[PDB]
Write an enzyme that holds these catalytic residues in place. Sequence first.
Site, PDB file in Angstrom:
ATOM      1  N   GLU A   1      -5.661   0.824  -7.426  1.00 53.46           N
ATOM      2  CA  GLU A   1      -6.749   1.400  -6.649  1.00 53.46           C
ATOM      3  C   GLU A   1      -7.495   2.388  -7.515  1.00 53.46           C
ATOM      4  O   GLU A   1      -8.694   2.259  -7.755  1.00 53.46           O
ATOM      5  CB  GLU A   1      -6.161   2.095  -5.421  1.00 53.46           C
TER       6      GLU A   1
ATOM      7  N   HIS B   1       4.746   2.836  -1.005  1.00 52.67           N
ATOM      8  CA  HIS B   1       4.301   1.436  -0.920  1.00 52.67           C
ATOM      9  C   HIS B   1       3.568   1.182  -2.240  1.00 52.67           C
ATOM     10  O   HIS B   1       3.276   2.120  -2.983  1.00 52.67           O
ATOM     11  CB  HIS B   1       3.366   1.166   0.306  1.00 52.67           C
TER      12      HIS B   1
HETATM   13  C1  LIG Z   1      -1.994  -1.594   1.547  1.00 51.17           C
HETATM   14  O1  LIG Z   1      -1.803  -0.206   1.901  1.00 51.17           O
HETATM   15  C2  LIG Z   1      -0.981   0.090   2.891  1.00 51.17           C
HETATM   16  O2  LIG Z   1      -0.356  -0.766   3.547  1.00 51.17           O
HETATM   17  C3  LIG Z   1      -0.863   1.527   3.101  1.00 51.17           C
HETATM   18  C4  LIG Z   1      -0.080   1.931   4.224  1.00 51.17           C
HETATM   19  C5  LIG Z   1      -0.039   3.332   4.396  1.00 51.17           C
HETATM   20  C6  LIG Z   1      -0.736   4.304   3.627  1.00 51.17           C
HETATM   21  S1  LIG Z   1      -0.523   6.066   3.995  1.00 51.17           S
HETATM   22  C7  LIG Z   1      -0.404   6.104   5.807  1.00 51.17           C
HETATM   23  C8  LIG Z   1      -1.703   5.527   6.449  1.00 51.17           C
HETATM   24  C9  LIG Z   1      -1.822   5.845   7.955  1.00 51.17           C
HETATM   25  C10 LIG Z   1      -1.620   4.817   8.856  1.00 51.17           C
HETATM   26  C11 LIG Z   1      -1.686   5.115  10.231  1.00 51.17           C
HETATM   27  C12 LIG Z   1      -1.904   6.425  10.732  1.00 51.17           C
HETATM   28  C13 LIG Z   1      -2.141   7.430   9.807  1.00 51.17           C
HETATM   29  C14 LIG Z   1      -2.020   7.130   8.431  1.00 51.17           C
HETATM   30  C15 LIG Z   1      -1.532   3.831   2.545  1.00 51.17           C
HETATM   31  S2  LIG Z   1      -2.374   4.971   1.543  1.00 51.17           S
HETATM   32  N1  LIG Z   1      -2.784   4.032   0.305  1.00 51.17           N
HETATM   33  O3  LIG Z   1      -1.404   5.972   1.162  1.00 51.17           O
HETATM   34  O4  LIG Z   1      -3.594   5.460   2.250  1.00 51.17           O
HETATM   35  C16 LIG Z   1      -1.604   2.429   2.406  1.00 51.17           C
HETATM   36 ZN   LIG Z   2      -1.594   3.333  -1.000  1.00 49.01          ZN
END
Ligand SMILES: COC(=O)c1ccc(SCCc2ccccc2)c(S(N)(=O)=O)c1
Ligand SMILES: [Zn+2]
EC number: 4.2.1.1
Length: 257
Positions: free
Chosen positions: A103, A91
Site C-alpha cells: 500500500e 493482517h
Molecule cells: C485488506 O485489508 C483489511 O482486510 C484490513 C482489515 C482491517 C484494517 S484496520 C481495522 C479496520 C476497521 C474495520 C471496522 C471498524 C473499524 C475499523 C485494515 S487497515 N489497512 O489497518 O486499515 C485493513
Molecule cells: Zn492494512
Amino acid sequence: HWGYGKHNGPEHWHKDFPIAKGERQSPVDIDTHTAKYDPSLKPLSVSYDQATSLRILNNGHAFNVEFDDSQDKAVLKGGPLDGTYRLIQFHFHWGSLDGQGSEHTVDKKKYAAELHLVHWNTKYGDFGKAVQQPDGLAVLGIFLKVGSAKPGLQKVVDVLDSIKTKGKSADFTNFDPRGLLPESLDYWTYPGSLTTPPLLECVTWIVLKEPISVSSEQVLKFRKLNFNGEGEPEELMVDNWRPAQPLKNRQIKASFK
Ligand SMILES: COC(=O)c1ccc(SCCc2ccccc2)c(S(N)(=O)=O)c1
Ligand SMILES: [Zn+2]
C-alpha cells in the site's frame, strides 16, 4: 459491497465513505528525498514478549491474526507516539504478482506485500472508541519482498488452507509476531488513516524502512485465499491494496540518517 474487484474497488469507495477524499488519507508514497530526519523522534519500542494470539479470520478482504488485547500484553510505544498502544490484530495486503501488493510505496517502488500490525491507544479504553480519535491507532507497516523464506511466517502460511473462504476462522494460539520483524526498526512516520472503509483518520503510521524477505512459495499461498464465501465461484484473494493517496498538507518524518 466495497472490495477490490472490477466494480467495487478503491476508486468507488468515496461514494459510501466520503472521507476517502479527505485531508489525511493512507497509504501514501514515501519520497525518501523529502522525508526529513527528525532528531526528536525516539527509537520505537515494540514489546511483544507477552503477546497472546487467539484466532485467524478470513475477513473477506484479507486475513486477521487476532490478539487478546484485554490486558497490557503486546504494546507499541516510543517512536513518534505518546502513551501506550495495544496490539489488536495484524493482517497483510498483497498482489497478484510480485511487482505489486504494498500500500505504501517508497520513491514509487511497490513491494510484493505489506504487513500491518494494528494497535490502539489505551487512553481511549477500547478499539471502537480509539478509531474515533485523531491519535487513536498506531499501525506498524512492514514491507515484504520475495527472496529467502521468512521462517516466522510459516505458521501463518500453513493455516491458510483452513480459512480459504470469507468468514472462516481457525484457532491460532501461541504465534509470536516478533518473528515478522526485520533487524532494524528505523522508520518513517506520518499522520493518516485506515486504508479500508471506514477510512477513519485516526492512524499514526510508522513504516519500517527495512523490508522482510518471504519466499515465492509463501506469498503464492497468500494468493490461494478467496474473497468469496464457501460454495461461491472462486475469486482469488489478490490485489487487496489501496493505491497511494494525495499527501496534501503532510510531512513524512524519518527516524534515521
Ligand atoms: C485488506 O485489508 C483489511 O482486510 C484490513 C482489515 C482491517 C484494517 S484496520 C481495522 C479496520 C476497521 C474495520 C471496522 C471498524 C473499524 C475499523 C485494515 S487497515 N489497512 O489497518 O486499515 C485493513
Ligand atoms: Zn492494512
